Design an enzyme around this catalytic site. Structure first.
Site, short mmCIF file in Angstrom:
data_model
loop_
_atom_site.label_atom_id
_atom_site.label_comp_id
_atom_site.label_asym_id
_atom_site.label_seq_id
_atom_site.Cartn_x
_atom_site.Cartn_y
_atom_site.Cartn_z
N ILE A 3 4.23 -0.49 -4.90
CA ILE A 3 3.29 0.00 -5.64
C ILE A 3 2.98 -0.42 -6.90
O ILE A 3 2.01 -1.03 -7.33
CB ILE A 3 3.46 1.65 -5.63
CG1 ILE A 3 3.48 2.21 -4.32
CG2 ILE A 3 2.38 2.20 -6.56
CD1 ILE A 3 4.15 3.79 -4.24
N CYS A 4 4.25 -0.43 -7.88
CA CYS A 4 4.17 -0.92 -9.17
C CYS A 4 3.53 -2.31 -9.27
O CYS A 4 3.27 -2.56 -10.20
CB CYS A 4 5.67 -0.96 -9.58
SG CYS A 4 6.40 0.74 -9.51
N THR A 5 4.10 -3.22 -8.16
CA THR A 5 3.39 -4.68 -8.33
C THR A 5 1.63 -4.43 -8.41
O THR A 5 1.00 -5.14 -8.95
CB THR A 5 3.77 -5.32 -7.20
OG1 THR A 5 5.32 -5.82 -7.71
CG2 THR A 5 3.05 -6.87 -7.17
N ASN A 8 0.58 -2.17 -11.65
CA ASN A 8 0.89 -2.60 -12.92
C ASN A 8 1.14 -4.16 -13.01
O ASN A 8 0.90 -4.48 -14.08
CB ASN A 8 2.21 -1.98 -13.71
CG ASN A 8 1.95 -0.21 -13.40
OD1 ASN A 8 0.76 0.39 -13.91
ND2 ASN A 8 2.83 0.39 -12.95
N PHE A 9 2.02 -4.65 -12.28
CA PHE A 9 2.32 -6.11 -12.28
C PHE A 9 2.08 -7.25 -11.08
O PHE A 9 2.98 -7.68 -10.31
CB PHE A 9 3.96 -6.00 -12.45
CG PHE A 9 4.43 -5.15 -13.37
CD1 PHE A 9 4.28 -5.34 -14.79
CD2 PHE A 9 5.28 -4.04 -12.74
CE1 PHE A 9 4.86 -4.24 -15.80
CE2 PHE A 9 5.51 -2.97 -13.89
CZ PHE A 9 5.30 -3.18 -15.28
#
Length: 255
Positions: A3-5, A8-9
């Site tokens: 998810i974070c990728t 956000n990243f």
């Protein structure tokens, strides 16, 4: 995909395009759907309220935001909204991320945070004369207009003109903003109660309704792919990711 990728990243055009598709759902389908349901049952305020931890507020506030704050009255309101959303995604939220993780942020191990599968982003600056920027508003504003049953326009010159008068609220990164780095997820009932007395009563909004949009990648006469390609390439430009044209995008969009 982490998810974070996605959130956000991102580091690859595939992450960007996936995000763009997500955006399409969260902007032109979900809001309308919830808003219609809220205007149909009573089981909505309750049912939704019986939902998992944080979702209740998220939902109930989108509804509030869709029924009052952002409910457009004019095409110019739609164009304004798009410009504001563009700033939220390609400027504000970027500046917020850079606030939580400055370009020179180091890990506890002394390593650079912005390294490896991570690309440090930079905020964009709106420019009507930038085809990509305009491509985005044209597509987003039109899809947004549809969502409320309004007629849009494909007149680029007109929208460019309307934009000259659009003012963007200043933005400043806040302190307590949680931006997860790993898929490790952790004012609750008063903010919630506030909404319950705030959310207008269905009967106070006669024959008002919204038109959810189902994503169709094949109809080239849509703005659907127009949006995906624009939303995606802009995000890619935030993260110094090479853009993909409409064709490669739909081709790499087997996802």
């Amino acid at each position: 995909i982490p998810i974070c990728t996605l959130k956000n990243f991102p580091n690859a055009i595939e992450h960007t395009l996936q995000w763009a598709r997500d955006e399409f759902e969260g902007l032109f389908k979900q809001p309308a759907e919830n808003v219609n349901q809220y205007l149909t049952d009573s089981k909505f305020v309750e049912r939704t309220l019986r939902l998992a931890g944080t979702q209740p507020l998220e939902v109930l506030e989108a509804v509030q935001r869709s029924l009052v704050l952002q409910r457009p009255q004019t095409w110019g309101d739609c164009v304004t909204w798009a410009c504001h959303h563009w700033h939220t995604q390609y400027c504000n939220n970027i500046r917020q991320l850079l606030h939580n993780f400055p370009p020179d942020q180091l890990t506890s191990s002394g390593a650079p945070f912005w390294s490896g599968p991570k690309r440090c982003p930079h905020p964009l600056t709106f420019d009507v004369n930038n085809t990509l920027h305009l491509d985005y508003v044209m597509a987003a504003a039109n899809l947004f207009a549809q969502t409320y049953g309004l007629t849009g326009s494909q007149d680029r010159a007109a929208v460019a003109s309307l934009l000259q008068s659009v003012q963007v609220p200043e933005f400043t990164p806040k302190s307590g903003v949680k931006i997860h780095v790993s898929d490790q997820e952790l004012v609750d009932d008063s903010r919630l109660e506030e909404l319950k007395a705030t959310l207008p009563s269905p009967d106070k909004l006669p024959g008002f309704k919204m038109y959810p949009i189902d994503f169709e990648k094949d109809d080239d006469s849509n703005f659907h792919m127009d949006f995906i390609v624009a939303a995606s390439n802009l995000r890619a430009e935030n993260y110094d990711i090479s853009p993909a044209d409409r064709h490669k995008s739909k081709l790499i969009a087997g996802k």
